[PDB]
Design an enzyme around this catalytic site. Structure first.
Site, PDB file in Angstrom:
ATOM      1  N   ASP A 200       0.840  -1.151   0.000  1.00 45.63           N
ATOM      2  CA  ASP A 200       0.000   0.000   0.000  1.00 45.63           C
ATOM      3  C   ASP A 200       0.890   1.220   0.000  1.00 45.63           C
ATOM      4  OD1 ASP A 200      -2.641   1.237   0.329  1.00 45.63           O
ATOM      5  OD2 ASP A 200      -1.946   1.867   2.292  1.00 45.63           O
ATOM      6  N   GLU A 229       1.504  -1.268  -5.208  1.00 40.79           N
ATOM      7  CA  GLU A 229       0.538  -0.299  -5.654  1.00 40.79           C
ATOM      8  C   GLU A 229       1.328   0.760  -6.351  1.00 40.79           C
ATOM      9  OE1 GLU A 229      -1.603   2.100  -2.580  1.00 40.79           O
ATOM     10  OE2 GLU A 229      -2.934   2.801  -4.211  1.00 40.79           O
ATOM     11  N   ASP A 296     -10.156   1.690  -5.387  1.00 43.22           N
ATOM     12  CA  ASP A 296      -9.737   3.115  -5.546  1.00 43.22           C
ATOM     13  C   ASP A 296     -10.216   3.828  -6.807  1.00 43.22           C
ATOM     14  OD1 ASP A 296      -8.523   3.031  -3.040  1.00 43.22           O
ATOM     15  OD2 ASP A 296      -6.732   2.073  -3.866  1.00 43.22           O
TER      16      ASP A 296
END
Ligand SMILES: [Ca+2]
Lengths: 439, 440
Positions: A200, A229, A296
């Site tokens: 993350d 990510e 997201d």
């Protein structure tokens, strides 16, 4: 290089508080009805037992790996505010239920990737509350970057955080004791049977730390998967010392530019995909985790403005590419919604709620990929035939395949124009074709 | 005639296609959107057909079948009252001439409806028999049991299927034959490319031999296609028609794509049988269709499922014989059987299903571009209970339309002898998927 199993992987991303509520006794007092609009503060009771109970759905789609968003004890519905990285959130289930998920997953051929949230924790975390409480006398003062005492979230937090958010205090990764905790988190859940870690906001920490991370994780096993990510170029993560790949948001933007926006034509897309291919180093194409959406972004169908056929063009492209394709829970049945919280709608389990032909269309692309080995290991070549038509060729040792994707009102393509076959193939409006040949 | 191999037909029910001339409109004309009934008029006209040739051509059609256009007192015009005039609401002979010219200019052919078993009770001959009885010179142009003529109870004269307003022509009278052959000759002189025979089974083959001789005498390339809902074999011996409306192929296709009653083995067998029954030279003359003015609309037969409907079209366009599209089906009009299927054609394109239109166009364009799809043999091959290949082969060239009614499958081209020559070894078909491939 990335681990080889990845060539065969097909990921199903799950936001666990929304997939299935199999256990109402775990639900919080303020639990909302399963049909409610998702919000940044509401809870639906999605749980680990809900995932176990719908493993059949996930298998039947073609998926064999899960990417799970955060599952550790937290105070939010997304759980990025972890408060104990060493237990499963009490609303998701216990460690036993987690073990039962691992086992049921591996009996069915399904690998598991957890979300590693190492830049920050929640303000409810024990170490952070100890600092709030004991201030300079806390043994964990230097586990964070707190400007002074007393700790205030008002008016602006007087500590470092993730993008200004008061309840996400930033972990001081310059502290060895923090790194040791982060590495013990990595190893611990690998000791519980996981297959990889998704990172993350890895760009808020630093490469030096991510180097130690790869060493600790690969030290336990060379086949454990690390995926970064990253929304921009992936290249920095593919140098052989941090990750096995990136969430391929670059391919997402390119594909959707073509299939939903109309801003980019087939030539710009092919060029985009050939360049990303040139950009990504050898050994790491297989590790890219390709997607058309996530927790997201807005939902794929919403981005396509309810045009299910166009949306199918996106999936055709998605499943056609080098890298492991990932479907975001509920997109396969045609769920709609804007960006977060809009994309975090509860998954319906009334098959009459599903867009079945969307599901079967995706199943078909997945099935062709799983059956054709070049679709998993072959080389990727992207070629525009006209402004509205693209061929994604994939080249195996003893076989070759193409997925041809047309966004216009119908055309014909001479496969002699695509460097084994000299067939003509016709494509309808919003049509695709999926061809293989022995070499 | 050879030209049928390249023919694609668009069937128009002229009352309902396009109303370009309000001056032609009848007094109680209804709004264009209205529900069709057995008596209402919408004012569709011949100029409206001229005005919309673009749409026809863009569909991929190069031939019209028009339902009757002669002067009559119904909306369907099966009750002709004068066979040597265009109905006054359709236009004039001039307009008719203009339509022919425009059609010739686009390489479009025209086929009219020959309604020879019977005329309308308003026809001058019939009214003259009603008036002058045994003293009328036309008493034997009909079969009147006795005077006075009465419909009242049930007609005391022969009719088409008991209908009092459709008295039956006595085709046993040479004067009536002479009249019938003048009608065929007259409209052929006005530029026409052929004739569809209305209920030819109600007359007799001796009459249809004379009919053929007169028509072919004008020109061998004039086409003759008979209405027949059962076996077409009797019409294909070289002495009567060039083909029939292929309702057999319709029942097979829809049983597979819509009803679910027939699977792919049964459909492949059905079609292979039909093909073998059709004599050599007559395969191309078969007028293939999925619906007409005498059937419920295709989309309605498929219970509104457009993708299912497109499987029908794929099949239709894959067969040997000339494929025909019933006006408005290409845009997704719905309707039950007559009167329901005689809706007026909307020209506001926001109401059309354009994916359905472009779907059909693609099947047409494939067929126009592939020589085998027009002049090649036909072999139908069941692969699955839900999946069928229609193969067309020109000597050594080959085309194949593959049609899947299930949720998705794979077609291994090898191991199917007729599909084997395609370079592609496997082909995927999505749910209700279609695949069209051609060799070389
Ligand atoms: Ca009019």
């Amino acid at each position: 290089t990335a681990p080889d199993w990845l060539a065969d992987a097909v990921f199903y991303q799950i936001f666990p508080e929304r997939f299935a509520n199999a256990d109402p006794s775990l639900d919080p007092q303020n639990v909302v009805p399963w049909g409610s609009t998702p919000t940044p503060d509401n809870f639906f009771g999605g749980d680990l037992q809900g995932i176990i109970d719908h493993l059949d759905h996930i298998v039947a789609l073609g998926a064999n790996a899960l990417y799970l968003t955060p599952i550790f004890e937290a105070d939010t519905n997304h759980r990025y505010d972890a408060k104990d990285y060493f237990s499963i959130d009490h609303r998701l289930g216990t460690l036993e239920t987690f073990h039962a998920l691992m086992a049921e997953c591996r009996a069915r051929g399904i690998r598991i990737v957890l979300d590693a949230v190492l830049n920050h924790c929640g303000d409810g975390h024990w170490a952070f509350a100890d600092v709030v409480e004991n201030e300079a006398d806390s043994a964990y003062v230097n586990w964070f970057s707190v400007e002074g005492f007393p700790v205030t979230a008002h008016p602006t937090p007087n500590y470092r955080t993730c993008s200004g958010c008061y309840y996400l205090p930033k972990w001081n990764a310059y502290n060895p004791e923090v790194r040791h905790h982060h590495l013990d988190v990595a190893r611990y859940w690998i000791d519980q049977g996981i297959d990889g870690w998704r990172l993350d906001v890895p760009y808020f920490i630093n490469h030096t730390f991510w180097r130690e991370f790869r060493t600790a994780v690969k030290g336990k096993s060379e086949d454990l998967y690390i995926v970064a990510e990253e929304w921009r170029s992936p290249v920095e993560w593919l140098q052989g010392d941090t990750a096995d790949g990136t969430m391929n948001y670059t391919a997402r933007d390119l594909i959707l530019g073509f299939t939903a926006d109309g801003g980019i034509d087939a030539s710009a897309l092919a060029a985009g995909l050939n360049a990303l291919h040139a950009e990504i180093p050898a050994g790491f194409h297989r590790g890219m985790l390709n997607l058309l959406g996530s927790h997201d972004t807005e939902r794929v169908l919403t981005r396509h403005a309810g045009d299910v056929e166009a949306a199918l063009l996106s999936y055709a492209l998605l499943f056609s590419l080098e890298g492991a394709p990932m479907v975001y829970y509920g997109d396969e049945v045609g769920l709609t919604g804007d960006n977060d919280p809009g994309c975090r709608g509860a998954m319906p389990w009334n098959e009459e709620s599903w867009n079945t032909r969307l599901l079967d269309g995706i199943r078909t692309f997945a099935a062709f990929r799983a059956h054709q080995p070049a679709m998993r290991r072959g080389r990727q070549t992207a070629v525009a035939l006209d402004a509205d038509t693209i061929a994604i060729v994939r080249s195996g040792g003893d076989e070759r395949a193409a997925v041809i994707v047309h966004r216009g009102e119908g055309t014909t393509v001479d496969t002699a124009s695509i460097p084994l076959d000299a067939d003509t193939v016709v494509l309808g409006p919003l049509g695709t074709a999926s061809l293989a040949t022995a070499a």
